[PDB]
Amino acid sequence: SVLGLLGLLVGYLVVLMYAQGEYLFAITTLILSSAGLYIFANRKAYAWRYVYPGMAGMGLFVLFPLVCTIAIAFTNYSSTNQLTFERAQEVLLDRSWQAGKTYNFGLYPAGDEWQLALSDGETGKNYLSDAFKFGGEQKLQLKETTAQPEGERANLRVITQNRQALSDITAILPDGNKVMMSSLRQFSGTQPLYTLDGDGTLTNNQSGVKYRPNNQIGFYQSITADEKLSPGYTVTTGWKNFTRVFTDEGIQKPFLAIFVWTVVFSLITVFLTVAVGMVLACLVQWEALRGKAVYRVLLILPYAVPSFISILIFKGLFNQSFGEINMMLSALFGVKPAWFSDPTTARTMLIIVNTWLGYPYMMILCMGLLKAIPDDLYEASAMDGAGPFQNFFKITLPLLIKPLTPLMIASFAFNFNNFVLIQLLTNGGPDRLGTTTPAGYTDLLVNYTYRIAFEGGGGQDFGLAAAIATLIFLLVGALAI
Amino acid sequence: AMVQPKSQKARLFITHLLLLLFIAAIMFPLLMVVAISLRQGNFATGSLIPEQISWDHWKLALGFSVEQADGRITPPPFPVLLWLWNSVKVAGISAIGIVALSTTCAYAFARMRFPGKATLLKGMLIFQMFPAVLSLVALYALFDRLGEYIPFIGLNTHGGVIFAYLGGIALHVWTIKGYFETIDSSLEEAAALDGATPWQAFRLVLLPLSVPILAVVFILSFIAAITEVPVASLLLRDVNSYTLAVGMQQYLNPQNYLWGDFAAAAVMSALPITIVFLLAQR
Amino acid sequence: KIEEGKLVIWINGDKGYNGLAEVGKKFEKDTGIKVTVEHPDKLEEKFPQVAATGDGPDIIFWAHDRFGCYAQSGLLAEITPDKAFQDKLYPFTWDAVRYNGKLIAYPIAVEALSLIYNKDLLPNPPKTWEEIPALDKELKAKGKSALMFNLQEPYFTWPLIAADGGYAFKYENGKYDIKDVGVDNAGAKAGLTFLVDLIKNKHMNADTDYSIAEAAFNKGETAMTINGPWAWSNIDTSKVNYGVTVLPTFKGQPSKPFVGVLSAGINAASPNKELAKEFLENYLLTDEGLEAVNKDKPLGAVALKSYEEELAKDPRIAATMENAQKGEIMPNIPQMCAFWYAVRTAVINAASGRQTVDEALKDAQTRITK
Amino acid sequence: ASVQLQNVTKAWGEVVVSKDINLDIHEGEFVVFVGPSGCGKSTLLRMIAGLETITSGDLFIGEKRMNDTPPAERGVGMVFQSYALYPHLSVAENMSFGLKLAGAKKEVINQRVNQVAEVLQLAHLLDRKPKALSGGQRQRVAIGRTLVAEPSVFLLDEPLSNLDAALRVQMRIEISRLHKRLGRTMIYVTHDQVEAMTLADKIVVLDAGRVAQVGKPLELYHYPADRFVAGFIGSPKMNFLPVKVTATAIDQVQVELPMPNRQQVWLPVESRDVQVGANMSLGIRPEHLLPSDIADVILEGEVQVVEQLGNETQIHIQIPSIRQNLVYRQNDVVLVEEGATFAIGLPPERCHLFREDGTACRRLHKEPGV
Amino acid sequence: ASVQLQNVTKAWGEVVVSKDINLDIHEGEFVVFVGPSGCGKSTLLRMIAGLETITSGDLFIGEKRMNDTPPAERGVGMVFQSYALYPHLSVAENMSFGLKLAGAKKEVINQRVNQVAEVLQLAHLLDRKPKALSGGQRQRVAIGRTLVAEPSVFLLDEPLSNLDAALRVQMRIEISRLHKRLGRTMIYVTHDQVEAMTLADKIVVLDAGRVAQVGKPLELYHYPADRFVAGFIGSPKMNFLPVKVTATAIDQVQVELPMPNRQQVWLPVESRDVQVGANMSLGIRPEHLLPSDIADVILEGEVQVVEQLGNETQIHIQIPSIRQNLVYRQNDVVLVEEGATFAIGLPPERCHLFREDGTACRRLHKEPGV
Ligand SMILES: CCCCCC/C=C/CCCCCCCCCC(=O)O[C@H](COC(=O)CCCCCCCCCCCCCCC)COP(=O)(O)OC[C@@H](O)CO
Ligand SMILES: OC[C@H]1O[C@H](O[C@H]2[C@H](O)[C@@H](O)[C@@H](O)O[C@@H]2CO)[C@H](O)[C@@H](O)[C@@H]1O
Ligand SMILES: OC[C@H]1O[C@H](O[C@H]2[C@H](O)[C@@H](O)[C@@H](O)O[C@@H]2CO)[C@H](O)[C@@H](O)[C@@H]1O
Ligand SMILES: [Mg+2]
Ligand SMILES: [Mg+2]
């Protein structure tokens, strides 16, 4: 019933995955599909039915783009080397040079059929084609005339409506050569810049220079019996990107240095957010407190505001010379801290902002997790004569840290790769001096690798960044063993 | 409810002031936005408390044009309301999807016995630790090949952005499993003896008792998707299909700093998550 | 894949995008084809990224200096104006949009920075950079300040640096020699040192950006600013009594601002190259179209000869051209867009006090060459 | 040490859960509060302990008022119903926790722990955590904890209530022998009437908050104040027969039985404030009932349930015209099958009598033990 | 309809909790498994229900093997120890949940619940939820569920374990009346020996996962097969005295008491497999001890505890030369103060004798009811 209809797509997609190329994606599409049919059909595998749809998402949208990203590392993927070879030549073959001169054209109705007219400005002569029907690639031989065509000239709107059929019409003069639509008002001779023969050798039509695909650098290059055509294509390079990480001194320089900041940043985040989160969660549920429910919503509010807009409003608030925080921080005290210029002051700001950002989540967590403690433990403590502080450190805290550990080691993992905070607030903070790659003081491992690949200027090597992305992750694979 | 020592109020009163000062410290930034959203002009700098109200910034956030006495009617620079509904769609559908996938999977992990259930969960977490930001190159290529076959979940689609998030469930799976292993075993066993199949026990016994955890998982996932930037702005290309996160960063062009217009939209951007919190009192 | 049947246009946010849209509505009225104008953040970066995958706008707006990098990357289609159209613009603007003997964009308007002064606070603006610190003390005690302009971009700080003898690439008779860069020399150092000395004497903040500068001048807090024609529309609204004049001279030598020409290129991946041609040639680059944009935010001294002569009578544009003559035209070579990144890093790190001018520029010098 | 309650009342907004109840508990006295679940036993204990505020009335411990004194300074300890053992702490840390905080003494801790662990055989469990221990051991840690603290008043909220029947019986002896060895004031709370009888110097019966009766265990058994006390104390429940008063004297009262054979008998009981024709309740305990050949008052019915306990035989008899199976009790083994006919003797000397409201008529029959 | 277990063995990894145990349970038989907590009572019940796997052995329910048969198709109904009441569902839905799913019958559901709710008095609590009910009401709901199910086999896991003492006595009658009414197979599990003795037709005593004895309650009481069985049955624990065998005879066994007055008594007990000089345990129940004036074998010592139960009197006596208190039990009321000297008679006819391995010597005295 449903086995056959879902079995229909296995062969409607599977077979077409083999066709039209795409060999890289045709493999996993069947492996994941055939496993889903085997599990959901016979009742021998029932436990996997609850697991499969979960891991299928994990595979397609987490595991694949990772394996694929590691494949990106073995190649020279760059701002220049960005497309496949068949997309590179597709671009190169598309571009065209103008040969012949321009003519002004007009569209004139003759019953149901149309009529074209060009006008040479050099000679002053006019040319007019026979009656034709719009549609398909057709050639029209124009004839010289002194008379006017019957029927009024078509307005722009009408010529725009028939633009597609008009672009395929290749008109030709009695004297000149082929001429095609160049705008809504003009016709000019536009021939393709290159031609591709039997072998993959592009030959120029204006200069006449031939070009062959150089698969060492990834470009079409000029050969003599050196020009480099620069749309560019992606080609494998092997261990060349991985070796650069172990070879370079200017890439390795901040690489170890920001690692320290990354871990230190996330440790201090976890510690302060848990502290603030827990202490408040204890206080909001405290019996003796009056407006518990009012306090509860107010302390949570920061979380009801999206992270990115908080960071952006903080960025403007933390401005050094101007900006409202230092405006009042110089009125009292008298200091205007260098929140962006100084490495430490910036690093401090990050933590202040992140603590603001991160405490509500820990509070909410502790609020629920706090209910796992039975009330009579504090009643037995009251008999023995313990104060509020004594209760917290001898009972509350040690009884919360165990169920909390996995959630805060998860918080360390989150804040380890907290990309959006750094990019939006500081984007690397103060610049790290004398580096071959773009690097900052507040950059995390995710930020540094991102700068290497995507940041305009100072190199855009997607491959090198992919090599470092793999090198991080595989070394985090030590957290397993 | 228990007799209290040392006048009690010594600590109670001093706590009221400490929280009262704390809420002031944390509300300040948000009160700035509200103030900037009412201040006239789009300048980055201005008076802490506005001399006179403006409304102008709130007018173009809601879609109205305004007439400044100088150069005629200025139109709303960005479709903020559309961006708002877009964010709700992508995160809402996203979060239901995440709950459904992660809740069912955890049920098998907590109850059903199958070999290597420990290593798969371990592996799921470790793989998820790798940031999606260092995969954007591959992600674009993924939805590029995927787009030409199933158009409604490819590049420049909300379905694509939703299906992109549907991977991150490992964390939730653990949490939900952990919650399941807290519920009394007898209930599912008593259901089994009554005749209930493993699914019947899931829906009629286990689910209705797990409402609060699934509520939290939804809220967390909903928040997570509302603020996602890297992937969202990578896949979503058309302005009219932007989510709040993608679009809201167009306000702060260094040479076209619309700081006022931004503030009105920023307060408006807090609405969906707050709506969720206020409905989640059950 | 860029959609066929419509025109997506990208233009920097500080230009008159709403006006340009009005031109698009007329194009829609006549052709029935919808024009979408957008002003994405960091446009100079976004376009190369999207266009390389065959995406982005059909028409792209920037100063001509970035267009050489775009053309070399295969992101630009060769534009094809006939003899009659080329004769409608000034020849020196076509030279700005020429890369390897080919026209890669339509030049729209000539841009140049000028010193903008508040008349009520300062009736006689300084002819020299040297007399500003003295003037600042005078105005600072009055509750105000002398000069506030964007320091985060080199485009705004290059006039002072290139005054005593700074340059990007030495232009030999024929072509730009890319091995001779004048950001390291004594002239470039002396200029940037003067900037740092204005910061070290509290006349300026190291982190003053475009947003703060535009705020300070339009609210009447500073007497002077350094800005382009696009910014005049905001000053009109603020009803500040302002003049536009020559840039101050440093060490006797005049400030030499890099002259930009706002240019419109056609995406090499557009299936609307014919419609893109008609819009720009017959709608934008007419007396009516340019007026629509200039009425939103001033273009400066336009490339279209007909509208330029209507526009030349405005003293603001006279002063724009006067400073343009004293500066030199921005090169379009692919090494130019790599020129700005290093100078950005150099100036900001020098102004902050992280590096001395000598150390900050030496890093930039070895970066341009490589 | 001496704990006394004057008009103590607990309310929850509007729900008066406990009426104004007076209790006088002398130094070193073993007092047991008994009643059904939810009758307010723990509420009282918590009010004495300080874990619950007193809405109305006065509470004294050692002849000073404690109502507003914090729980710690009351000189009072509590074994909690759930044991309230700290899950994260060891047995030795659970037992010493009290004096561990404030006034910590390393050497004194070791003594008090090992001494109390000696008398409860817990020296081998000190290093262990509560989750590793069995229920029975965890109880000994709970009691052990307060024994280390050495309070003047011990408060026990159902310490035996969660143990195996055989372990419950054994632990009763331990508590008795602990009581006499210490000689200190102990307030005990249970629902088991057996524990009240075998432990208490003085019993306090609670009926929906109200104190029903106070006195010696053996006094509560023979002479109950109302129908509730009579029905609550005793191994199997006392037999209640609806009777009608026909004759009244100065010494005894005659009542009519609900049988078709209307028999009448005099009962040596109080005759102050009694009326003829009042529907009363006859009280007779299963143990007190006699064989048919001895007595003159005979009740005959059908045997429904026979419970062979080994040490005794309990027989449930369906007497006609009354929907209540009469319970008999006798030593050794009685060979009577289920369904067979049986007759018993009703002794007037061992009879109780209750009013319409439930108030018991004072028994004049002198019993040994009071 | 008739469950039976052959060579049944349960194991956890390597630990073999239960060895090959044989049990045969007849149709309509009421079988009670008794033993301490953690002796495997629930496990046995769970293995019959299919919630737990039988490692080695055969399980029959109504003359067919059930080992691998899913729990649902076992024709069995369990009352869980926790009650296993669905918190989200009402009382009505808790009792009808079985026939709600797998073929709903709206008309029938209403009937089957109301018929069961009538014979438990749950009619006014149908629409209520498990949190609103009390523990006593919750128990009846848990039983109700299976009564609606009407299975061939009932499995009750300590249904009286958590109730009040007085309510635990009342419900025992409600159970026995329900058994003879339904007339179906019932497997009962409890730690309380009283429940075993009253309710069961056949008792199975468990000791560390091992079946120690099977038989009628009165057989278990009079003739235990080992020391464990003897010490598990009977209100207070049987007295045990360390004796040394001095002489043997086909008809009886002679032992020596550990006293300085080394008395030697002849016990009417199986001399089979008993040697002279072998150290043994003399068993004697508190009820079976006689007043001193009756017998000639006297035991004298100091009174440690006097427990006035009202209906009886329990007396604990410290006999020198045995550091275990001799427990005495006498009907009516005995006026003896603690610390006084008390002597009792040790009747040889009523004595048990156990070997080193705890195995009982078969009693040759004929007790009535066996
Ligand atoms: C770095 C810290 C930043 C903190 C930011 C938070 C900002 C809010 C300002 C409030 C500051 C606290 C001032 C203390 C005021 C006393 C409050 C009080 O006296 O109220 C107490 C509330 O408890 C309680 O939070 C106990 C009181 C908590 C005090 C302990 C605070 C020390 C935190 C540092 C420890 C780090 C945690 C380590 C995490 C890995 C009363 O408790 P009890 O009735 O005995 O307990 C029993 C009941 O709770 C049972 O449910
Ligand atoms: O801790 C800083 C961080 O906290 C929050 O991030 C949460 C996230 O929302 C959850 O989904 C989960 O993964 O845990 C994270 C932290 O442990 C805030 O959302 C975020 O703004 C802030 O940076
Ligand atoms: O600052 C580097 C930047 O300078 C120029 O950009 C100018 C632009 O030409 C103006 O029209 C206006 O938008 O201000 C910009 C500076 O903020 C160059 O055109 C550009 O290539 C370069 O990156
Ligand atoms: Mg209680
Ligand atoms: Mg059990």
Residues of E with CB under 8 A from a CB of B: 49-51, 70-72, 76-78, 80-82, 84, 86-88, 97-98, 101-102, 145, 149
| Domain end among E220, E237, E254 | E237
Beta bridge partners of D59: D5
Question: Do residues D306 and D288 lie in contact, with contact meaning Cβ atoms separated by under 8 Å?
Answer: no
Query: What strands lie across the sheet with C114-118, from one edge to the other?
Result: C145-147, C222-227, C114-118, C242-245
Residues near C248 by beta carbon (within 8 Å), at least 6 away in sequence: C115, C125, C126, C127, C128, C129, C131, C132, C255
For residue A406, which of D231, E363, B125 has the smallest C-alpha distance?
B125
The dihedrals phi and psi of E157, each to the nearest 5 degrees, come to -100, 95
3-class secondary structure per residue, D6-60: EEEEEEECCEEEEEEEEEEECCCCEEEEECCCCCCHHHHHHHHHCCCCCCEEEEE
Helix or strand holding residue A429 (H, E): none
Q: What is the identity of the amino acid at E143?
A: I
Q: Which two tokens stand for residue B192?
A: 């089994």
Taking the centre of ligand 4 as the mean of its atom positions, its distance from the CA of residue D189, in whole angstroms, is: 8
Which of A98, A157, A456 is facing C30, going by the closest CB pair?
A157
For residue B113, which of E101, E46, A53, E53 has the smallest C-alpha distance?
E53
Based on the fold, state whether residues E84 and E215 are members of the same structural domain: yes
A118/A292 Cα distance (integer angstroms):
84
CATH for the A79-100+189-247 domain, from 1.20.1730.10, 3.40.50.720, 2.40.110.10, 3.10.650.10: 3.10.650.10
Three-state DSSP class for E216? coil
**CA dist list (Å): C4 to A429, B145, C7, C34, C275:** 42, 21, 8, 11, 10
Based on the fold, state whether residues E308 and E339 are members of the same structural domain: yes
- Residue D269 sits in a domain of what CATH number? 2.40.50.100
Q: Which two tokens stand for residue C15?
A: 């230009």
CB contact under 8 A, B256 and C13: yes
Q: Which residue owns the Cα nearest ligand 3 atom 9?
A: C63
CB contact under 8 A, E310 and D335: no
Q: Which residue of E has its CA nearest to D175?
A: E305
Residues of chain E contacting residue D304, judged by C-beta atoms under 8 Å apart: 177
| Domain end among E237, E256, E276 | E237
CATH class held by domain A1-78: mainly alpha
What interhelical angle do C337-352 and C357-369 show, nearest 10? 160
Q: Can you list the alpha helix ranges (DSSP code H) found in A60-185?
A: 64-73, 85-94, 156-161, 163-167
Q: Which residue owns the Cα nearest ligand 3 atom 16?
A: C155
Q: Cβ(A378) to ligand 1 under 6 A?
A: yes
Q: Which two tokens stand for residue D4?
A: 């006394």
**CA dist list (Å): A157 to A153, A182, A184, A186, B247:** 12, 16, 9, 15, 34
Letter string b/e over residues A41-64, b meaning 16 or more CB atoms within 10 A of that residue's CB: eeeeebbbbbbbbbbbbbbbbbbb
Residues of chain B contacting residue D52, judged by C-beta atoms under 8 Å apart: 1-2
Does the CB of A97 have a partner CB in chain C at under 8 Å?
Answer: yes
- Torsion angle, alpha carbons of A347, A349, A352, A354, to 10: -70
Q: Which domains, from first to last, does chain C contain?
A: 5-111+260-331 (3.40.190.10), 112-259+332-370 (3.40.190.10)
Interface probe for E, chosen from D30, D137, D164, D330 (most Cβ of E below 10 Å), is: D164
Q: Which residue owns the Cα nearest ligand 2 atom 16?
A: A411
Based on the fold, state whether residues D51 and D119 are members of the same structural domain: yes
E143/E121 Cα distance (integer angstroms):
12
Taking the centre of ligand 2 as the mean of its atom positions, its distance from the CA of residue A274, in whole angstroms, is: 12
Residues of chain E contacting residue B196, judged by C-beta atoms under 8 Å apart: 72, 101-102
* DSSP 8-state class, residue C78: P
Q: Which residue owns the Cα nearest ligand 1 atom 51?
A: A286
Residues near C127 by beta carbon (within 8 Å), at least 6 away in sequence: C246, C248, C249
Q: What is the identity of the amino acid at A45?
A: A
How are beta strands E56-61 and A126-128 bridged, if at all?
unpaired
Question: Do residues A188 and A100 lie in contact, with contact meaning Cβ atoms separated by under 8 Å?
Answer: yes
Q: Does some domain include residue D369? A: no
Residues of D with CB under 8 A from a CB of B: 50-53, 67-73
Residues near B139 by beta carbon (within 8 Å), at least 6 away in sequence: A65, B132, B164, B231, B234, B235
Based on the fold, state whether residues E135 and E113 are members of the same structural domain: yes
For residue C59, which of C287, C270, C290 has the smallest C-alpha distance?
C270
Helix or strand holding residue B45 (H, E): none
Task: Mark residue E186 as left, alpha or beta (left: phi above 0; alpha: psi -120 to 50; beta: remaining).
Answer: beta
Q: Which two tokens stand for residue A244?
A: 């650069």
Q: Cβ(A307) to ligand 2 under 6 A?
A: yes
Taking each continuous run of H as one helix and of E as one strand, the counts in chain D are: 8, 20
Pocket residue to mutate for ligand 1, from A270, A286, A390, most atoms within 8 A of Cβ: A286
Task: Determine the length of chain A.
Answer: 481
Based on the fold, state whether residues D75 and D211 are members of the same structural domain: yes
Q: Does some domain include residue E369? A: no
Based on the fold, state whether residues E176 and E248 are members of the same structural domain: no
Does the CB of B1 have a partner CB in chain D at under 8 Å?
Answer: yes
Q: Domain range spanning residue D25? A: 1-237
Based on the fold, state whether residues D232 and D243 are members of the same structural domain: no
Q: Cβ(B13) to ligand 1 under 6 A?
A: no
E214/E256 Cα distance (integer angstroms):
31
Residues of chain B contacting residue C20, judged by C-beta atoms under 8 Å apart: none
Based on the fold, state whether residues D136 and D51 are members of the same structural domain: yes
B193/B195 Cα distance (integer angstroms):
5
Q: Which two tokens stand for residue A326?
A: 């230092």
Letter string b/e over residues D93-113, b meaning 16 or more CB atoms within 10 A of that residue's CB: bbbbbbbbbeeeeeeebeebb
3-class secondary structure per residue, C117-161: EECCCCCCCCCECCCHHHHHHHHHCCCCEEECCCCCCHHHHHHHH
CATH 2.40.430.10 for domain A101-188: yes
Q: Which two tokens stand for residue A304?
A: 């009801």
Beta bridge partners of E298: E345
Q: Does some domain include residue E370? A: no
What interhelical angle do A462-476 and A64-73 show, nearest 10? 120
Q: What is the identity of the amino acid at B47?
A: S
C abuts E (3+ Cβ pairs < 8 Å): no
Residues of chain C contacting residue B259, judged by C-beta atoms under 8 Å apart: 211
C350/C331 Cα distance (integer angstroms):
25
Q: Which atom of ligand 3 is nearest to the CA of C64?
A: 19
Which of D49, D50, D86 is facing A395, going by the closest CB pair?
D86
CB contact under 8 A, B254 and C12: no
Q: How far is B159 from chain C (nearest CA, A)?
A: 19
Query: E100-104 long-range CB contacts below 8 Å, 24 or more apart?
Result: E101/B194, E101/B195, E101/B196, E101/B200, E101/B204, E102/B195, E102/B196
Residues of chain E contacting residue D368, judged by C-beta atoms under 8 Å apart: 333, 335
Q: Which two tokens stand for residue D359?
A: 């108030």
How are beta strands A126-128 and A138-141 bridged, if at all?
unpaired
Does the CB of A160 have a partner CB in chain C at under 8 Å?
Answer: yes
D359/B29 Cα distance (integer angstroms):
72
Taking the centre of ligand 5 as the mean of its atom positions, its distance from the CA of residue D307, in whole angstroms, is: 25
Based on the fold, state whether residues E246 and E227 are members of the same structural domain: no
D46/D71 Cα distance (integer angstroms):
9
3-class secondary structure per residue, C220-270: CCEEEEEECHHHHHHHHHCCCCEEEECCCEECCECCCCCEEEEEEEEECCC
Residues near B178 by beta carbon (within 8 Å), at least 6 away in sequence: none
Three-state DSSP class for C48? helix
- Torsion angle, alpha carbons of C360, C363, C367, C370, to 10: 160
Ligand nearest to the CA of C159: 3
CATH superfamily of B1-282: MetI-like (1.10.3720.10)
Which of D49, D73, D88 is facing A398, going by the closest CB pair?
D88
Q: Which regions of chain A carry the CATH code 3.10.650.10? A: 79-100+189-247
- Residue D196 sits in a domain of what CATH number? 3.40.50.300
Q: Which atom of ligand 1 is nearest to the CA of A378?
A: 47
Q: Does some domain include residue E368? A: no
Taking each continuous run of H as one helix and of E as one strand, the counts in chain C are: 16, 15
A abuts E (3+ Cβ pairs < 8 Å): no
Q: Which two tokens stand for residue D220?
A: 């509560």
How are beta strands E352-354 and D64-65 bridged, if at all?
unpaired
Question: Do residues C280 and C9 lie in contact, with contact meaning Cβ atoms separated by under 8 Å?
Answer: no
Which of C41, C53, C237 is facing B70, going by the closest CB pair?
C237
Q: Does some domain include residue E367? A: no
Q: How far is D233 from chain A (nearest CA, A)?
A: 31
A367/E51 Cα distance (integer angstroms):
36
Three-state DSSP class for C59? strand
Interface probe for D, chosen from A383, A396, A402 (most Cβ of D below 10 Å), is: A383
Chain breaks in chain A (C to N over 2.5 A) after: 225
Question: Do residues D255 and D244 lie in contact, with contact meaning Cβ atoms separated by under 8 Å?
Answer: yes
Q: How many CB atoms lie within 10 A of CB A244?
A: 17
Domains contained in chain E, number? 3
D354/D280 Cα distance (integer angstroms):
6
Based on the fold, state whether residues E267 and E222 are members of the same structural domain: no
CATH 1.10.150.300 for domain A248-481: no
Residues of chain A contacting residue D103, judged by C-beta atoms under 8 Å apart: none
3-class secondary structure per residue, D202-214: EEEEEECCEEEEE
Task: Determine the length of chain D.
Answer: 370
Task: Report the half-sphere exposure of B68 (CA within 13 A, side-chain side).
Answer: 19
Q: Cβ(A89) to ligand 2 under 6 A?
A: no
Q: Does some domain include residue E79? A: yes
Query: What strands lie across the sheet with A138-141, from one edge to the other?
Result: A96-104, A186-192, A178-181, A169-172, A138-141
Q: How far is E36 from chain D (nearest CA, A)?
A: 7
Based on the fold, state whether residues D23 and D151 are members of the same structural domain: yes
Q: Cβ(A279) to ligand 1 under 6 A?
A: yes
**CA dist list (Å): C141 to C132, C134, C144, C146:** 14, 12, 7, 11
Q: What is the identity of the amino acid at A27?
A: I
The dihedrals phi and psi of D249, each to the nearest 5 degrees, come to -120, -175
Taking the centre of ligand 4 as the mean of its atom positions, its distance from the CA of residue D97, in whole angstroms, is: 24
For residue C267, which of C116, C55, C115, C101 has the smallest C-alpha distance?
C55
Q: Does some domain include residue D151? A: yes
Letter string b/e over residues A254-290, b meaning 16 or more CB atoms within 10 A of that residue's CB: bbeebeebbeebbebbbebbbebbbbbbbbbeeeeee
Resolution of the determined structure in angstroms stands at 2.9
Taking the centre of ligand 4 as the mean of its atom positions, its distance from the CA of residue D18, in whole angstroms, is: 15
D317/D330 Cα distance (integer angstroms):
14
Q: Does some domain include residue E151? A: yes
CB contact under 8 A, B3 and D72: no
CB contact under 8 A, B1 and A306: no
Taking each continuous run of H as one helix and of E as one strand, the counts in chain E are: 8, 19
Based on the fold, state whether residues E73 and E138 are members of the same structural domain: yes
B46/B41 Cα distance (integer angstroms):
9
Residues of chain E contacting residue D81, judged by C-beta atoms under 8 Å apart: none
Taking the centre of ligand 5 as the mean of its atom positions, its distance from the CA of residue D115, in whole angstroms, is: 34
Q: Which residue of D has its CA nearest to E36?
A: D164
For residue E265, which of E300, E296, E227 has the smallest C-alpha distance?
E296
Q: How many CB atoms lie within 10 A of CB A358?
A: 26
Does the CB of B189 have a partner CB in chain E at under 8 Å?
Answer: yes
Which position has the token pair 């007419």? C286
